Assembly symmetry: D3
Homo-oligomer: 291 residues x 6
């Protein structure tokens, strides 16, 4: 029962994803293809990273993550296939996912395959890796790859072989760490008592505002649930609420909640109302938080 | 062979649904997860209800419906899990779904699990139920649920246990009928000869206009197929057409068709043209029909 | 391991696709339903055709394509079910899909079931067919089909029977060629030595512009890779670039690439930037190319 | 004391109109320049005609109307200057404008100067004319006119000379009637009992809907104030109301009023609410009235 | 040198305002018509009132304000014409307007003529009046007024007569105070020591936000310039700044300024940037201020 | 008969402009106020400059240009009042404006009064100046200026005094050239045979594209009417046409015209169609022209 969890920038409007999947079932008949999402901003590797980084703990060990935005499609670039180390806890607390105490996931239990364009930056940062290979073997990629469709040729296709039991180390040569492209993650800076970050994401479809200010950034400033915060967005929008676990703690529908999102990050929202949408709050806006 | 049909407000733009599915495949390795849709207006329980009420007769017996919009996520609230009674005939004529004479579905064959926020109102109204349980057992939900993600913790996760054969009566204590939250459904009023309802939905992607005026409401003012009807929307934009089975009966493309939709309700459309969109017709607009 | 690849105009916003899938699993329990897309412009048979024409080669043999926009729903019209002949190579070079030299598909290995409304025009043209039948048997369609939902009644339900091994020739009588509705595709017309076609698609989500000017139209005009092209769109907007295999060949991010798409047609893009969106380029705009 | 009323497509966003006015005050120091409007759809002669046809009876005798959209700017074309015959009664009843019994205007009291591109079609149709001259004399136009600004050179400038008392017959040679460009006006057709016209204008800023069905057309099918009428727009959106003098006769705010507008034409509106805007009703939509 | 200052809801897109002006010049040839604005939300008497209430002090004595939105056009309603009492100081400090110490205006120096529909509510409140009359005399209005155009018939035309020296008291009978329709203005309400009002206007084209919280409301709460204010808008968006005289006091371009507008009310802006537009702030949003 | 030509950023939607004008008539009873435009992008001094720079030749000598966007309102900044030197020819040719050979305007014949914020940069660059004074005298400005309305206090008010004959040199102290704020005009660069500039303006309401590439830039590259040009916009849109005097020279409606606009600058448009609007071409886009 192999699983490919499939995240791409291919959209939901044509047969692009179906082509990949058709090939996945062709190569790995017993595969279950699980869509992550296909609507990421094309070529936004940092956004794509966000949709794939917290996946492992939710999936059975041995799951293969075929994750791709491939702007360098048709070039001599080749994908990277990595076996991660830690599946890694997560969420507002830092816990295993599932009922009871959650599913503890073994180490070295997930493979990601992606363009080597930095899409896996946070995956490697947060999970670490045991081994990483360039995907070159004609056994797992086309000998004549479609130039404009490396997401299919260099990710979907080899992902299905990996899911089918194709040995990871046989995809091509091992890559040294410096050969794995990374994008830079701008740090949350200490600017006084304040933590200064950005709006990392508008949380669709709700219009919640996600920051790159992590629980760990907060914990080491002393900020926990109950702490009375000023969260300033866009330089000019204080917001003031206690840090609370959830939206409803804000009381009346529409009230401001400052909370920790399911990924573990400082967030702001309204209670059963959209914060971001009516006021056109966007990713990239500044986010400062002080107690 | 078990099936969970999954309806949420989680959107299709990030890994939220994928996190749920990964846990569903984790808990119930043989499961098939069928998306209903994930694009409902967040927190709009009445709209979510529309997407799930007609589902049972389409699905194999034993299907679990994991249905969720969870505005009260992170609160002490707990989901309700119900075995419905009748799968119930549906459509313009009221029939079993499928080839030949349709597939008759044994009673008690489907479980819904949902926030106990009234999402299941029309499910219970239309199918009845045999048993209802609060979902509280740590065998089916996290001991430390993500405060902001009860749709995962309190729906997706225990739905997978239910699909995996976890005895329904073991999820929590039985709920009495008055403990199951219901929303109020606006009645269709008789106003003289007229029937007064509402545009209950714009039928995307076609821009057909669905009202809450049922066929039973029509055959109460004498109205069957063939009847010249006047249908006014938003109080001002009126329409005249016979009540016909389908769009093409309007004749020319763009012509107004008044019909019964596939859920049995008085609707208005253009034949192979959008009615709602050019005129920005919206859900919530008054709808009056008179013969 | 039966597969139904499912392409409809049903959208992704309600339970319509789920109703179809439920019945698919009801009828063929071991089936895997693979979504192609569901977001096509309703009733645009030419567009629906693009999303289905090059599917066969990507899918395991025996795959059934359930492909439907059904504007004549509720009429006396009946679907056509065809077994196509050659699975047919594609891409910018014309190959079999997959790793290695790709995966050859035996002839007569795929069935399409569709409204008989021309949706299968390009499938038949490109693949040929071995047998075509009207879908009328109450073994495979409802005796009382829902008038407004033939996509489910006359495509979804019967496709599942076909996926389950119901003999194709027993679905109804054989259709002669002339009985299979076709749409006409406008030809690429000559104007001096310029090729005049149309923008056949904006390739979402990338904003690439696809024209109906094929590789054959080009190399029949002595235009090969490396050729300096002037591409005018909408009779106004001119672009000049050499013909190149892929986007990154344009050089800097945002530079114009004129290339052949993964479907084999003259297309235009910005490199890792969206061309169509900032300029509000649309399907149906004229496209003129010249050396 | 001379007045030039100035209607152009020059917009209100730059100094274009101001350049015209400066020259108008330069040439005719005592002049009063009255803006009609400057926001007409560029090059839409029929729309510009609407803005100028009803003007004469409102203005003191001797007023010059400088009316211009000039798509043929910079060509050998020359403006036409005409002394109209009758100032003509107007409105729903047809009357002189002003207090008491209105201000009767002597015949031959108004001059229009315009591109000879049909802008004056309805002016001539409704007022008749006494004399018409091509505007060519270097005493009233630049010897070296700005190619792209004939609205200034060939309208604003000579209009100011005319206001300054430059003899009209001295502007150029007389034009014969066939040399004055006219546009074709769609006739109002009798279709059974119905009258078929068009939405001739959306009446901004109110979103009232003006048709080209005249009161004379109405009192030809027997229709006067009080008559229950059915009015359909865009073929599909029909409306029923008595024909009433004014909006408030509809009773409640938002209620449909069918009336004769201030230019004598069958119109539809809501009472103190916008009709056109919520429904995106547009000029050019068919309009059928039947009693 | 008679002046009519003209404020209507007639828009700037057709000949409506020009028809009025033509008649104004017909009746009072030496008149200067000064446009206030013509773009007010149709029928929004409260909004119309804002554009006219502080005019008198800026205008030469004897100016007539012809001020009209006329939703009850064509009814038995007649306009009111009033001579106001004190021309009344204004601004953020309360002064006479002009160079030097400004220009004092004699009392009883201005006439407003308007629908009797409350448009003059704040004019009367702020200025008082010496005399008020119903406008009925066929000397100043048409005997056959155009039903849909009372703004012209019952405001424009009679204002020109008044501008021309037609005795005010001869326009019709005197109206008692109670006969002059007033609208109610919602009060700034107390909540703790916070002032709760509304966004009374988005100050176009700047995107400044004007509230109905007046200088008096503030310094009645012990809020003076230099006071640190928290201004929450729409019950969501918080801003903090000291109260300052002007925008540039915020410092950097784009910084928040909370200030008193040139009309004397608490307002909020970005310095030389638009506040309202990026945040889609609207008139009618709640505005809460607190020290 | 003094004239104030009045250009501001005050908009057309409230009483702001009327206040200024009221004061202008108060101070200079016999004044004619001529609106330039009031809809400039607030605080965009370069845009405002464009609306005022070519004004003088169109106006009678002695005209006063009250031109203002005043983001530094309420500060210790004071306006500059300048008497220009050359009225300066203009247009595609470089000619005097008016009928015959045009109105030659004497030198030193126009005064501009503006904030000293660089709004007059091009005015001074193109016309030169004879004298310039800071506007400080309480005879021409308020002693207590409205902080947020320096466009009225420091421009409209003193402009009316200047129009009334108030001696220019008495407004305040002479300013040295270095005290007159200028904005930088980026030069058109010679990059080969090419002239590289920008899109300086979208020419509303037509959607023509104006560049800052001047006839003088062209003449000294040898480019005149008839020259076959490639005009590349936005780096990726060649356009190719001869440089022609006017739009119609492009032939068919919608054809590309490259021409010299009425201000003397290289421009591109379609013939009686909008170039900029359908494709969302904007100011600030690159503009290269080569023969
Ligand atoms: N204009 C463009 N530029 C660069 N890459 C593009 C592109 N359009 C699609 N792709 C890539 O092709 C493989 C997909 O993943 C997508 O990122
Ligand atoms: N701002 C908000 N307020 C309340 N509930 C929210 C919310 N954002 C997401 N959810 C709920 O979190 C679980 C999802 O199903 C969603 O309904
Ligand atoms: N207004 C309309 N006119 C014609 N066909 C319609 C329609 N709405 C839905 N359908 C068809 O019903 C089956 C779906 O595939 C869809 O194409
Ligand atoms: N649909 C409508 N309802 C009510 N009044 C209207 C209207 N259209 C224009 N007017 C009024 O006619 C005089 C103008 O001032 C305008 O307010
Ligand atoms: N938010 C703002 N910031 C700076 N100046 C502003 C402003 N709103 C209006 N003005 C200026 O006030 C005088 C007008 O000319 C305008 O430019
Ligand atoms: N692109 C274009 N094509 C044709 N005429 C145009 C044009 N832009 C402005 N004008 C005309 O130039 C004089 C104005 O009145 C306007 O109609």
């Amino acid at each position: 029962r192999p699983i490919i969890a499939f995240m791409s920038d291919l959209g939901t409007t044509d047969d692009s994803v179906a082509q990949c999947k058709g090939l996945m079932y062709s190569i790995c008949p017993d595969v279950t293809v699980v869509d992550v999402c296909h609507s990421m901003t094309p070529w936004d590797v940092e956004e794509g990273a966000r949709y794939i980084v917290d996946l492992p703990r939710f999936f059975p060990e041995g799951t293969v993550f075929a994750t791709t935005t491939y702007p360098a499609t048709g070039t001599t670039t080749r994908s990277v296939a990595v076996r991660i180390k830690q599946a890694a806890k997560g969420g507002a607390r830092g816990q295993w996912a599932g009922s009871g105490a959650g599913f503890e996931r073994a180490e070295g239990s997930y493979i990601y395959i992606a363009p080597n364009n930095g899409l896996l930056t946070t995956v490697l940062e947060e999970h670490g890796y045991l081994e990483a290979y360039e995907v070159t073997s004609p056994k797992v990629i086309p000998e004549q790859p479609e130039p404009t469709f490396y997401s299919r040729e260099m990710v979907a296709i080899p992902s299905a072989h990996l899911a089918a039991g194709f040995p990871l180390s046989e995809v091509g040569r091992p890559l040294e760490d410096h050969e794995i492209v990374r994008f830079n993650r701008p740090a949350v800076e200490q600017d006084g008592e304040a933590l200064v970050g950005v709006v990392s994401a508008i949380d669709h479809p709700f219009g919640n505002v996600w920051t790159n200010i992590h629980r760990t950034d907060l914990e080491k400033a002393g900020i926990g649930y109950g702490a009375r915060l000023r969260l300033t967005l866009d330089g000019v929008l204080p917001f003031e609420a206690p840090l609370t676990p959830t939206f409803a703690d804000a009381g009346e529908i529409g009230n401001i909640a400052i909370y920790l999102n399911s990924r573990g990050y400082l967030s702001i929202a309204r209670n059963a109302a959209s914060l971001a949408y009516p006021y056109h709050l966007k990713e990239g806006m500044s986010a400062r938080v002080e107690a």
